[PDB]
Structure formats: structure tokens, C-alpha cells
């Protein structure tokens with residue numbers, strides 16, 4: 001029984017720190033995910049965990065509908081033979097990991 | 112953020128998990144098994160008195176701890192997302208003085 | 222059979 005959608009999710013397999021070779025790769029991912037979210041329901045917080053062996057990117061969207069749209073756009077792509085996968089994170093768990101994300105309510109839309 | 116030999120896992124269990132016999136041995140063995148796919152583990156303390164599900168770990172080098180932390184942080188365990196935070200070496204040695212002289216790599220219970 | 226990667 002799959003977990004219900006929340007405003008918050010974790011993408012996996014977005015990179016592999018052992019093999020990433022391009023300078024600035026993790027910021028490129030952050031900006032590219034923001035850009036993709038902005039073709040859907042936007043995004044209010046994002047963190048690329050550059051040390052994560054499983055390639056985790058954390059995202060908070062302004063509504064559950066927005067998160068579903070972002071998750072459905074990003075998951076299902078293939079990187080180095082692995083599928084980008086998304087898992088919803090309960091709000092209290094996400095806020096504990098990222099305390100600044102709790103009071104963020106304005107969309108990251110580059111000027 | 113300061114990498115060390117020591118870390119704290121959180122959200123690994125809750126008080127209801129404690130209602131089954133041997134629950135903490137299952138958790139210790141699962142942590143050991145994962146550490147032994149990386150750099151091993153020489154001390155582990157499952158904090159039965161934490162509502163937050165805390166497990167304390169010391170590895171034989173900073174490299175071993177980093178390999179474990181980067182594999183475990185953000186991982187799902189028993190239906191919950193786990194977080195890992197480094198513990199300064201003197202902090203861990205003050206909290207768990209018996210970990211100072213532990214040097215044998217741990218293996219899962221029989 | 223560990224509980225790592227066990228989804229809720």
C-alpha cells in the first residue's frame with residue numbers, strides 16, 4: 001500500500017557522487033529541478049545532498065497537487081541504468097531535516 | 112559539516128517498536144549488516160530510552176563512518192525515513208567511554 | 222532480510 005502524496009518528497013538515483021565529474025554538477029541539478037518544477041506546480045524548497053550515495057534530492061512544493069505533478073514529471077526517467085524514484089516524506093520528517101523549509105511559502109521562480 | 116568516526120541514526124524505531132521481544136537486537140543486527148557492506152562498525156548503542164529512535168554508532172575510521180553515513184542518511188528503515196548526523200569524537204567518547212577501547216569489528220547476533 | 226528500504 002503506497003504512501004499518500006504530501007508536499008514533500010525525496011528523489012533517488014539523481015546522481016552518483018563517486019562518479020560525478022562535472023564541476024558544479026550539484027547546483028546544475030538543483031537549478032534544473034527548479035526549472036522542471038516551474039513547468040508544473042513550482043517549488044518552495046529544494047536540497048541536493050551532494051554526499052548521498054543513493055543520489056537524493058529533497059523537494060518541497062507549495063501544495064500536494066504541485067508535488068504530485070513534480071514527482072510525475074521527474075520520476076521514471078533513467079540515469080545510468082537506474083530509475084529516478086520518488087518517495088513522499090511526511091511533513092514533520094521533512095521539517096526536522098530542513099528547518100528553514102517550514103516557513104517557506106513563496107515560490108522559487110527566478111526573476 | 113564535520114565528518115568523524117561516530118554518528119547518530121534517528122527515526123529508527125518508536126516506543127511501539129519496543130513491544131516485541133528482541134526488537135533492539137534486530138535493529139543492531141540490521142545496522143551491523145549494513146556497515147559491513149562499507150567499513151564495518153566497532154561500537155553500537157540502541158537507545159531504548161529515546162522516543163526519537165536513536166542509534167549511536169562508532170566505526171573504525173572516519174572513512175568507514177562516511178561510507179556508512181552516506182549510505183544510510185535518507186534511507187528508509189521500517190517504514191520511516193532515517194537521518195544520520197555525525198557526532199564529534201570527544202562527544203562520543205564522553206557519552207560512551209567504553210567505545211574508546213572497542214576495536215573488534217562487530218558481527219550480527221546468532 | 223533486513224528492514225532497510227522497507228516502505229511504510
Ligand SMILES: N[C@@H](CCCC[NH3+])C(=O)O
Nearest residue numbers: 039040041066069070072
Ligand atoms: N498537471 C501537471 C502536468 C502533468 C499531467 C500530464 N502527465 C502540471 O502541473 O502541468
Ligand SMILES: [Cl-]
Nearest residue numbers: 090093191192
Ligand atoms: Cl518518516
Ligand SMILES: [K+]
Nearest residue numbers: 072073075076
Ligand atoms: K516521468
